[PDB]
Amino acid sequence: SGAAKHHAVRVKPFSNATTQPKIPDGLLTSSLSRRLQNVVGVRNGNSPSVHAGSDVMHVVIAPTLGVPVMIANSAEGVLKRPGLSQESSFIGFPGQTVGFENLIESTGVPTWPPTIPTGQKLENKGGFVLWRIISQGLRIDLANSDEENDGWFEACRFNWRNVPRDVCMTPLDGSTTTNSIGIAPNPLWLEEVGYGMAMVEQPGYKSGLLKDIKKAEFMLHPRTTTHDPTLIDPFEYGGSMTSSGGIDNVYYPSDNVSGNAVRFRDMGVDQNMDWIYIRLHCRPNNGTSSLGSNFLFNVIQNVEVAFNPSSDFAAFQTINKADTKTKMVADGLNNNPDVFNGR
Amino acid sequence: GAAKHHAVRVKPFSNATTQPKIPDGLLTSSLSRRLQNVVGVRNGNSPSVHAGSDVMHVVIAPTLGVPVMIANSAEGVLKRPGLSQESSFIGFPGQTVGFENLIESTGVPTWPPTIPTGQKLENKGGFVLWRIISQGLRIDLANSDEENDGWFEACRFNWRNVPRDVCMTPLDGSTTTNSIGIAPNPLWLEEVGYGMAMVEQPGYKSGLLKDIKKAEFMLHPRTTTHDPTLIDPFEYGGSMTSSGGIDNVYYPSDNVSGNAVRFRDMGVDQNMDWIYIRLHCRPNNGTSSLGSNFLFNVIQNVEVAFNPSSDFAAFQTINKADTKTKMVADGLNNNPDVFNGR
Amino acid sequence: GAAKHHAVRVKPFSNATTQPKIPDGLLTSSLSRRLQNVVGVRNGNSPSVHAGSDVMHVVIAPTLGVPVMIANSAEGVLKRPGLSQESSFIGFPGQTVGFENLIESTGVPTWPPTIPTGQKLENKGGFVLWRIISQGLRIDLANSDEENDGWFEACRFNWRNVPRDVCMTPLDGSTTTNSIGIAPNPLWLEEVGYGMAMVEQPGYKSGLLKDIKKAEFMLHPRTTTHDPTLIDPFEYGGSMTSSGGIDNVYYPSDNVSGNAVRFRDMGVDQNMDWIYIRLHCRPNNGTSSLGSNFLFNVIQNVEVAFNPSSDFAAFQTINKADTKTKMVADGLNNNPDVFNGR
Amino acid sequence: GAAKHHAVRVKPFSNATTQPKIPDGLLTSSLSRRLQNVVGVRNGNSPSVHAGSDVMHVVIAPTLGVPVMIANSAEGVLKRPGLSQESSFIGFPGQTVGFENLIESTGVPTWPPTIPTGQKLENKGGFVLWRIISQGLRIDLANSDEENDGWFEACRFNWRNVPRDVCMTPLDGSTTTNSIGIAPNPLWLEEVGYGMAMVEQPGYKSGLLKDIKKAEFMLHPRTTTHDPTLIDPFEYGGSMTSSGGIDNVYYPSDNVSGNAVRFRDMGVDQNMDWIYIRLHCRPNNGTSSLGSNFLFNVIQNVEVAFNPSSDFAAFQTINKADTKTKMVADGLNNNPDVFNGR
Amino acid sequence: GAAKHHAVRVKPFSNATTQPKIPDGLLTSSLSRRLQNVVGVRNGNSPSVHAGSDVMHVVIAPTLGVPVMIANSAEGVLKRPGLSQESSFIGFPGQTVGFENLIESTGVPTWPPTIPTGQKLENKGGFVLWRIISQGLRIDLANSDEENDGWFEACRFNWRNVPRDVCMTPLDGSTTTNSIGIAPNPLWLEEVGYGMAMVEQPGYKSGLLKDIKKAEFMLHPRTTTHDPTLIDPFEYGGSMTSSGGIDNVYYPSDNVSGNAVRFRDMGVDQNMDWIYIRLHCRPNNGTSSLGSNFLFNVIQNVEVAFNPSSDFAAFQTINKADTKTKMVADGLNNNPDVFNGR
């Protein structure tokens, strides 16, 4: 049937079954989908202070809108965020429908970084307010030569604590300056949960060699029950959002109890999905004799949205027909807690 | 009888039962009311706001109490001159649903609200959880064969969910009664509706006004579970505003306050889509052409869970889940056509 | 496999499994705890508030940690004299659930809260998502056969959903311990309970106190997806309040603040209904006649999704969806009878 | 079905129909409600007013909303100490009937009334014409075999129709709610009831309290046409008064003002007789004897004509005249016996 | 799977799918858009060109973006007085297709073109290959029933294929907007249309204007492979021309230049035929009688192959060949009737 391609994309995020996947449950009567993808080379960094004497690169793949991947202790992170935000780098989906634009609220002039405490406005540029994740996957390949392919990795999926300050907003293209913004997992989660986490005790935890990580594939799991959409609400902020104050330009709620913090958390995250945390114990990188482990990151976030009539995409929307196999497809998918499976 | 419930679900004006429900077993004890109103509507002769324009703009939204807003209406021109797009509203007065505005400190009922003084929007329905079983609109042109020209175009759409797109106004369509309901805000036309490319929306249709009596407009639900809407307590000051004139149409001052989002959530069944209609009517200039006369028949079938303090709580019955509910919903919403035959 | 889960769903006190679930596959990885408590309750001898009254008022609510509130109990009269309707609370101390009040600036645990100074209600469970698999109360008249007179009446109702109808108090029923849960507020009796004509409510039943040992009260879930509740971070200054006395029962200071709605949403499983019970007991004069003594047995089967930091995360198991879940829920909630044969 | 209407006419607690009427065709379009309430009652331990007296005085009158007044009640002693004969009231809260007191100039709801400031007693029922199809009271002694002593005596009588014999008080039996109904005034006991020669009234009966569970008290209608009662607009100042204390029982200041007569006429169905009961209970001294415990079950079957502004007007049905109505009424009222078997 | 595609192929206005295709597997990766427009058209009141004439001439051509040209329309008389036969154009503004005129040396967009200075017609779609899945026109007489007189006649014909029979004008029907499409040139009426004896053409039909609402005009494709059109880069100086007036309708200055043939080939899907319609309307004197007002509804379903630079490239889907494509096309084109029952 026609739902076969949708189910295939549901269980295999990188599947080539269809360019316009859907969750065939009939929730979004008329909707369109985009397969957001990005491929980036990532290398563990040589940090002077924050990750001094550490060859561990920390990866969080989260169901956030636009910037699902956060990497701490990457060379790009050390370059772009020196000593700030855990020297992290972000992989997002620039030049694709989703995203926001920061404006000065009083005048409407786009502005990045935000000039807080002055009033700001995150303008939703996607032409949609309801969105959900069909499936989200990450593929990591060790791109070093055979004489430098040493190291290992550990990974586990987990139930996120839903703390507003665990998510942040950063440019979709991974820079610190472009005013096309997405929602990313905050590096603050690493130093409050991630670094101290007892990974081995999490169900589904797995480990392996970096030279074999190219055979692994990490994907988030949805619920077996109906996958409710996330509603993007209007968002304006003054001092209710904050950053480290440095050139990293990673902004997150100033606290966890304000109404803005909860609104930001709810609108920026698909809370039907789980999170995955990966530690890459890489080849050392000191810049003189060891130059770290270079990786190939391939992240795909399949998203279904309901476009509003003002959008030019509203003409392309198609009908979402409910299928009888959707629930059992999802249950079969999420009945295995293994953090990764073979490609 | 699940068959009668399904019949009402797919045909809002069906007479299968007087107590329809969504037979999914979500609300354990509940009671439903089929809110209805019949109103005559004519495109207005506005001096400035719609000067020279023969288009009457109709929005049918899944709001509690006042589903229909009509801009460039003769009633709108008379009641709300030069304000709120000279709109008129069709609601459900004298039926259980509704609110009453009070001055919060003293408790004195007060309409229009005395902003910035603290106000309270008291829920008078005796319920806090509500949902829409089905909503329908029927329009008939009431002109003679010598005056029955014109055409219409309509489409359903996914609403952008902006708090200022909804407003609160008297249920009976007046500006003073103080039996308030939630309506689509005429400000939606100024920002989305007027400049909207209707022809590009899926399910868009057009037709002649003389043939609109054979059409029927209904909102479409989701195929999945139809979650109910919760009415929260509502007190406000400067967080709500209006045009400041005698139109007495009030709405959130901005789109970002907590009150704005609470108002949006509680006033709208966000499981249902919206429909927009443009009526290209006979000109109404006041001297040589006197417009198109319409009969509007709007029905909103609502299911609520009454609280024990209500004088309707004793009449609640059980909601029994039926197997065919999802199939009925999917069959209903699989066709995006804005209207069908009656 | 899922038969034990269904058994616990329909029978809260069933011995089928120590780790029940709602087998719908909603929480992929989750663990469950069967929160239970057995207490002895007798009607009190109030000097002023319930002076001369022989009625104990019991509310069974789907609140996290302290589901039962008893007004005009001996323990209520002793611990909370002339305050909060001299009510007692039955909670689940020493088990996983609960909060801890802190001074926000320093993090030092502190009970009672030092209003209006900034307080933080730290969630001490390792979970943020929780839902009630099933909740039930058993009441046993422990009086001698010679003193078995009296009668009771009960009803289930759709809850007002007002923030001030819920409160926070120590889990162990005291006023001093800094392990806090969420309880139905005795203010609900003042506003709704006392003035309710219970006999009119659907599913209302009455019986003799000597036959209450054969009855079982249990809340009714929905037939649709039992969506979980999210515990949000909570910090309060003047947004919470109390009677000002030593009863230390704290609740939102109004029904409209952001904290009020957050508290109400996070503390209550809104997929369940509430139960109100009136116990008409033997009089308690304090010296010679000690009224009626009961055995209260309340069980709240809760499913939670533990976060990584929790030591319980290692024990979580996979929730597999079962085909009979909807049928079981609908069969359970299709009967509005407030109690069924034990 | 005239048979079901007649069955309800002669047996107030009959379950023949949920929509009884007097099938005489007087009210063309009407809707009926079976108002009911169940209350536990105990004879009180009064310090001064009923000191040393074990007699609890019960009046059941055809008043709208609060048919039963009970003097020397434990609830009366607690709620209305030393005032209004320490009476308690059984009404019908949360059911359609009732009034709301407002301050006339500002319209602010206000209970207790702020006399001498101008007040308004707003009719909240949505109707102005009402009548009683049948009214019944059932009393059961709830004491054990070791404490079930005592006796009772009762009689029906023609009421003297004195305005101060009726009063207005909250429907739910409290002193503060501000959902008002009409009750027999405890002042009737001080002027007629207490000194009344009950044994001389036709139909007088007596019995043991332990056997009162087998009795049933109902008011008798006329055999001729049962004319409806009209609720007039009511605004008052010094024309109404109370004891001045916290009992909040209000009644006409004199018996001759226009307001007094209007209050009397609108609050009472003057086609029905009154019944007076004396319960000679177990002593309630507070230490060695703790009184008799009763279950009061009162039902008032009312037929009204709803006005078009009411949210009940849509549900009204036709009253069809039946041939046997007069025979049924005459057979009912031909026996003056105060009570019969259940 | 392909049933929806076939439905759109035979019924241009069908609601089967928002992304139709010709399922022949010609374009491996492609996306489709259903270009639609609904406009009101009435016959004009010309001073000179069509002075006293009641005939509107309509050409439905397979031109990219502006398929319909109407001569002697009110809009044509207003926008293009005494020029280009006072014609109107119905195009598809704001949708993906279209061009932008530039000054070739600087790249600055410029409309109207600054002949004879070098101009560039930049293709603003992200595609170079395009073909028409199906094209249809619906005409609805919007006049009142009293003024429904008149008749129409139409025929389909094999097109001359002369470059000057096509032109470029703004997509939105104006003369100023710099979003350009390809339209049938009104010069074709002067050379062919006006002098055509339509009644002799095969498939010719005539009817009454009051019955045109029941007719549907659609172009006929071939039964063989529907080869796509290629949009070539286009730069022009004197090779293009206009009337020299403010109508801004531009077309090749001769039929033999390389640019003339390139323009003709790239702007027209030559697998389709053309349709010519004559509408004989009520007279329009400009003051009292306004002629006949129609509702024009034209849909052009186009399949394109987007190039990598386009943002639409990500949305392209696989075109799978279907066995019924040839049969569907042959069944469609085997009937030469110019219109069929709607």
Side-chain angles (χ1 to χ4, degrees), chain D residues 2-236:
Chain D
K4 301 175 177 191
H5 295 315
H6 299 323
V8 169
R9 181 72 148 164
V10 300
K11 275 169 275 264
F13 296 96
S14 167
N15 64 286
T17 175
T18 52
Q19 280 298 317
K21 304 184 183 203
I22 295 156
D24 56 355
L26 194 156
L27 300 171
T28 53
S29 91
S30 64
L31 187 70
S32 91
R33 190 165 186 143
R34 306 188 66 177
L35 318 169
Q36 186 172 9
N37 205 351
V38 174
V39 186
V41 185
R42 180 191 302 278
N43 69 292
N45 166 41
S46 92
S48 158
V49 172
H50 300 277
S53 184
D54 313 354
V55 186
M56 183 152 72
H57 306 267
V58 176
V59 178
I60 169 182
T63 57
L64 183 64
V66 195
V68 178
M69 171 259 302
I70 312 168
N72 191 30
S73 182
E75 177 174 310
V77 171
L78 167 63
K79 284 188 181 295
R80 306 180 179 74
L83 298 159
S84 283
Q85 303 298 296
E86 290 158 324
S87 308
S88 68
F89 299 95
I90 302 178
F92 304 118
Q95 292 145 86
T96 312
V97 308
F99 296 84
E100 187 166 74
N101 189 73
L102 317 165
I103 289 181
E104 184 269 317
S105 63
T106 81
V108 170
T110 297
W111 191 265
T114 52
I115 315 297
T117 310
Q119 312 287 297
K120 188 180 176 187
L121 189 72
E122 196 62 77
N123 179 18
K124 314 309 303 320
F127 60 89
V128 295
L129 286 169
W130 66 281
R131 60 185 180 173
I132 294 170
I133 301 138
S134 59
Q135 188 169 313
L137 171 59
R138 280 172 176 184
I139 300 168
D140 298 340
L141 181 66
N143 275 26
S144 67
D145 281 7
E146 304 80 41
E147 278 151 32
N148 62 346
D149 53 324
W151 62 281
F152 70 96
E153 51 178 345
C155 66
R156 59 179 76 258
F157 58 99
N158 304 306
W159 175 45
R160 61 186 194 161
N161 282 246
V162 159
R164 276 163 73 88
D165 289 351
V166 283
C167 66
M168 65 165 186
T169 189
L171 294 158
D172 64 356
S174 89
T175 59
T176 62
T177 291
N178 195 6
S179 212
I180 313 307
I182 308 301
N185 196 343
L187 277 165
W188 175 88
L189 295 164
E190 295 162 32
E191 270 137 29
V192 171
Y194 284 155
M196 174 166 164
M198 296 204 33
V199 289
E200 306 180 15
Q201 308 306 131
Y204 166 94
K205 291 177 119 204
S206 58
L208 301 172
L209 282 182
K210 60 166 77 76
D211 292 332
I212 204 169
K213 81 208 190 260
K214 285 126 66 153
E216 186 165 289
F217 307 86
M218 54 189 294
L219 306 183
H220 280 357
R222 303 173 172 184
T223 296
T224 61
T225 311
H226 191 131
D227 297 302
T229 295
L230 173 66
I231 298 165
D232 290 313
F234 200 79
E235 291 176 32
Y236 62 96

Side-chain angles (χ1 to χ4, degrees), chain B residues 160-177:
Chain B
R160 61 186 194 161
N161 282 246
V162 159
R164 276 163 73 88
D165 289 351
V166 283
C167 66
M168 65 165 186
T169 189
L171 294 158
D172 64 356
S174 89
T175 59
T176 62
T177 291

Side-chain angles (χ1 to χ4, degrees), chain E residues 161-180:
Chain E
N161 268 260
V162 155
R164 283 163 68 78
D165 287 350
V166 288
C167 60
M168 61 179 207
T169 46
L171 284 158
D172 64 359
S174 88
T175 77
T176 56
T177 317
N178 198 354
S179 289
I180 308 307

